[PDB]
Design a protein around this ligand. Structure first.
Ligand SMILES: CCCc1c(SC2CCCCC2)c2cc(Cl)ccc2[nH]c1=O
Lengths: 401, 517
């Protein structure tokens, strides 16, 4: 029996374009889809289907096996809502991530919706029509699948849940976050127990290297000020600028005394001794910055935004906020090439957004689209895909982090 | 026969109920003849008063043309054709290549029974008091929205088997043209063809006879296609005395087309003729440099150069040169300096930039192009040194990445004509700018700028500063704008101001630029 699903009222199906893939990826995609065809998971479609979703081939961590990744971003957006997050999970010591996508492959998709799951394996230099298909079963990556498989899912989990209540389990799209605080040795073993307990029902790889996220250790990178021996006119000016900026967040920041040191068109390199007044003013500014601005609460009904700044030498800076300057979180990331790092970053950041709020953020990437579109699939490993847009990182925002 | 593709009208719409224009009895007579035959053939079938739908028909020896615009407006969208043509370099050499004309293919394919009713038209009767014959299609209507897609699709299914049965062959569909390439012996190749025509025929699919088939070379959408090589249809440059904006615009067009195969084509000088132009018919006299370019190009064109096909076996090598400020020339080849394709890149991304950035962008275009044509990225050979690249790289806010590339010492070598000092300069005077500046050493200059804009005054100040300052300068400004611009170390710009500054910068020994609120 198939649960009748519908697109939000009025909304038609997606007709997204397919970005040019590399022969190798096309091959992977063909090998895969042909087997999924044999297994009745998908079926070829005709020209009467004008819709299309982009597919991609990514690489599994610790496997020679490729993974088909469908960008149902647009579809999920035109897909009706369905009618929660364990705030405790973010507190666990170890969160391991499992890919339970194959779960869905054993559940038919409402015949009428199938047409919307249309996708295409492009062909090189347009020498052939391209291979068109649509799903018959629940498709991995579609927001719908988790929902519909929700029931059949809770069943499967209720035993372990009661058997190991010291363990928190969260499902998101094709991912399942298993958390605890047990000794690493134990954590890993109990995990494996779940794997086999999942097999007991039916077709689960370790996402993220089968390694553990340690959310407990996640911490907010506060703003920091240059602590130096001697202070030159330039140092001060930079200092003041930075403070001035930070002021809009922490309005308790005073510069009056530091600016006084800067009276008179002096020489950048001239060393300026600080008056005790300013000395104390700085000290206060420093303490004020020691922690995030109070009053920043997460709104479940607002989009989670995530901007990244390139700092150079394998170093990057990010911030998760819903309202400008009202950062719910900020962090750093160190190494690879710009792109690899960058993707690795986005994925780290996303995973957290999920773990913490259960929602993927919407990134603002410091890169040229054509570029990203070209290499991202080369390092991407998650099963989901965040919403993203490309931008131009302002010179100063970078200097302030 | 082939499996029917189910069609439907657009949601919430109804079949075409359009009235049939009046028809000349001479045209009525011609239609009936045509329709009878079609019916005798099964393509259409007389229907009854049941069907209230109708689509206009008119006469154009006599021919039949039905206006499907309205039906098409009411017909669902299809995944369509492809509007993605292969580029000759993407192809591989072949010993023989024959092309058959799938004569009236659409009429050879059935039509979703449930849809047939919407194709209903009417041949008016000659005399007043009498009724006019009503029909509907059983096959793909010529001019109908579906037809193309549905026809191709079915074609492919029909070809699918034979395709896997005959691996030693390849086929390309394009409208009603079927190209068959092979590396078989003419005889074998020529028979396999016949082996194919039968398979088609097995589905009543007819194709021209060898006696009337088309063999290479092929003049396809701006191309000339030989089994072993390709090029662009020959290009003849005029020799006018009087050149019109229009003539020039076109020339520039044709010239670009060449670009992909003919290296060194240059259109700068000509393109310059279009400045200020008030009419498409306006005549513009050629410059001394425009005449030079035209003539240079004329010569490059006099040489028949050709492209080579893709040899999946060999790697792809891409080579890029700076042809002019902003201009970059490249050629992708597999075998030593024997191109599959070549090309240019003038794309200036942003009001200001530097060769490093601009060269890096050229790389991304080529990379995309390659993937689209050969499914793979080529190994690049660039006139830049890793150290140079790496330096600009790590120091630029935007993330970037260049595939696999080898430095090729082929002048000119892209470089960084200057680098801002990371730390302020001791011993170097200090300027505080805003239209004027003041230095730690007492000096000051104010200037009245006319017409300028807020931002353009900020760069002027700075310019002013650089000018008057000695070899080593420290500059403080509040304009975040100018700071970004200069921090970005551009070496070329559409704005002259910016260029003057850039000049200053190059000449300096050390320059430190700082910002303050
Ligand atoms: C049918 C396979 C495509 C193919 C062609 S057909 C080519 C298809 C586009 C329309 C024009 C003709 C081809 C033609 C020539 Cl003339 C030489 C090499 C070639 N190598 C190939 O792989």
């Amino acid at each position: 029996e198939t649960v009748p699903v519908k697109l939000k009222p009025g909304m038609d199906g997606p007709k997204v374009k397919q970005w040019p893939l590399t022969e190798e990826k096309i091959k992977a995609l063909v090998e895969i889809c042909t087997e999924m065809e044999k297994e009745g998971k998908i079926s070829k479609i005709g020209p009467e289907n004008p819709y299309n979703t982009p597919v991609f081939a990514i690489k599994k961590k610790d496997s020679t096996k490729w993974r088909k990744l469908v960008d149902f971003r647009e579809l999920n957006k035109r897909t009706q809502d369905f009618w929660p997050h364990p705030a405790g999970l973010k507190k666990k010591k170890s969160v391991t991530v499992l890919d339970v996508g194959d779960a869905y492959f054993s559940v038919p998709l409402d015949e009428d919706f199938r047409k919307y799951t249309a996708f295409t394996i492009p062909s090189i230099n347009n020498e052939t029509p391209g291979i068109r298909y649509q799903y018959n079963v629940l498709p991995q990556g579609w927001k719908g699948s988790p929902a519909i498989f929700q029931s059949s899912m809770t069943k499967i989990l209720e035993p372990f849940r009661k058997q190991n209540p010291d363990i928190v389990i969260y499902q998101y799209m094709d991912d399942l976050y298993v958390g605890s605080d047990l000794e690493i040795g134990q954590h890993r073993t109990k995990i494996e127990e779940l794997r086999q307990h999942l097999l007991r029902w039916g077709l689960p790889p370790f996402l993220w290297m089968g390694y553990e996220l340690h959310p407990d250790k996640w911490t907010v990178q506060p703003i920091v000020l240059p602590e130096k021996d001697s202070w030159t006119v330039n140092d001060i000016q930079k200092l003041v600028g930075k403070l001035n900026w930070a002021s809009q967040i922490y309005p308790g920041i005073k510069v009056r005394q530091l600016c006084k040191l800067l009276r008179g068109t002096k020489a950048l390199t001239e060393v300026i001794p600080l008056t005790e007044e300013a000395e104390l003013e700085l000290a206060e500014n420093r303490e004020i910055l020691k922690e995030p601005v109070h009053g920043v609460y997460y709104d479940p009904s607002k989009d989670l935004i995530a901007e990244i700044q390139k700092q150079g030498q394998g170093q990057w800076t990010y911030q998760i906020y819903q309202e400008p300057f009202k950062n719910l979180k900020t962090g750093k990331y160190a190494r690879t090439n710009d792109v690899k790092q960058l993707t690795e970053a986005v994925q780290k950041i996303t995973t957290e957004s999920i773990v913490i709020w259960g929602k993927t953020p919407k990134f603002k990437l410091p890169i040229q689209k054509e570029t990203w579109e070209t290499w991202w699939t080369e390092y991407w490993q998650a099963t989901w895909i965040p919403e993203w847009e490309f931008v131009n990182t302002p010179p100063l925002v970078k200097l302030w982090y | 026969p082939i499996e029917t593709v189910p069609v439907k009208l657009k949601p919430g719409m109804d079949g075409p109920k359009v009235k049939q224009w009046p028809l000349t009895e001479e045209k009525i007579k011609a239609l009936v003849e045509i329709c009878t035959e079609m019916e005798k053939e099964g393509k259409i079938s007389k229907i009854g008063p049941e069907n209230p739908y109708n689509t206009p028909v008119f006469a154009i020896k006599w021919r039949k043309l039905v206006d499907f615009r309205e039906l098409n407006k009411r017909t669902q969208d299809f995944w369509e054709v492809q509007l993605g043509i292969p580029h000759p370099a993407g192809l591989k050499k072949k010993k023989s290549v024959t092309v058959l004309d799938v004569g009236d293919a659409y009429f050879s394919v059935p039509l979703d029974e449930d849809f047939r009713k919407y194709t209903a038209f009417t041949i008016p009767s000659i005399n007043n008091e009498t009724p006019g014959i009503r029909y509907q299609y059983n096959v793909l209507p010529q001019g109908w929205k579906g037809s193309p897609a549905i026809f191709q699709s079915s074609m492919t299914k029909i070809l699918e088997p034979f395709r896997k049965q005959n691996p030693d062959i390849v086929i390309y569909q394009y409208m009603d043209d079927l190209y068959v390439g092979s590396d078989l012996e003419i005889g074998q190749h020529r028979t396999k063809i016949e082996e194919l025509r039968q398979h088609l025929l097995r589905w009543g699919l007819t194709t021209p006879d060898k006696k009337h088939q088309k063999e290479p070379p092929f003049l396809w959408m701006g191309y000339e296609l030989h089994p072993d090589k390709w090029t662009v249809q020959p290009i003849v440059l005029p020799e006018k005395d009087s050149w019109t904006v229009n003539d020039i615009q076109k020339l520039v067009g044709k010239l670009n087309w060449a670009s992909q195969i003919y290296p060194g084509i240059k259109v700068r000088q000509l393109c310059k003729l279009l400045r200020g132009t008030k009419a498409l018919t306006e005549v513009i006299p050629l410059t001394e440099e425009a005449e030079l370019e035209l003539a240079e190009n004329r010569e490059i064109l006099k040489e028949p150069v050709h492209g080579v096909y893709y040899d999946p076996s060999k790697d792809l090598i891409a080579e890029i040169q700076k042809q002019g400020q902003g201009q970059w020339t490249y050629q992708i080849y597999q075998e030593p300096f024997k191109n599959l394709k070549t090309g240019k890149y003038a794309r200036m991304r942003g009001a200001h930039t530097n060769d490093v950035k601009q060269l890096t962008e050229a790389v991304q275009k080529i990379t995309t192009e390659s993937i689209v044509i050969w499914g793979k990225t080529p190994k690049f050979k660039l006139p830049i040194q890793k150290e140079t690249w790496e330096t600009w790289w790590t120091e630029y806010w935007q993330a970037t990445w260049i595939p696999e590339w080898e430095f090729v010492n082929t002048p000119p070598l892209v470089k960084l004509w200057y680098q801002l000092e990371k730390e302020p300069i001791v011993g170097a005077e200090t300027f505080y700018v805003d239209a004027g500046y003041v230095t730690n050493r007492g000096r000051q200059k104010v200037v009245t700028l006319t017409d300028t804009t807020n931002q353009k005054t900020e760069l002027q100040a700075i310019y002013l500063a650089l000018q008057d300052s000695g070899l080593e300068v420290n500059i403080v400004t509040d304009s975040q704008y100018a700071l970004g611009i200069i921090q970005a170390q551009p070496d070329q710009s559409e704005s002259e101001l910016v260029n003057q500054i850039i000049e200053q910068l190059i000449k300096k020994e050390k320059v430190y630029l700082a910002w303050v609120p």
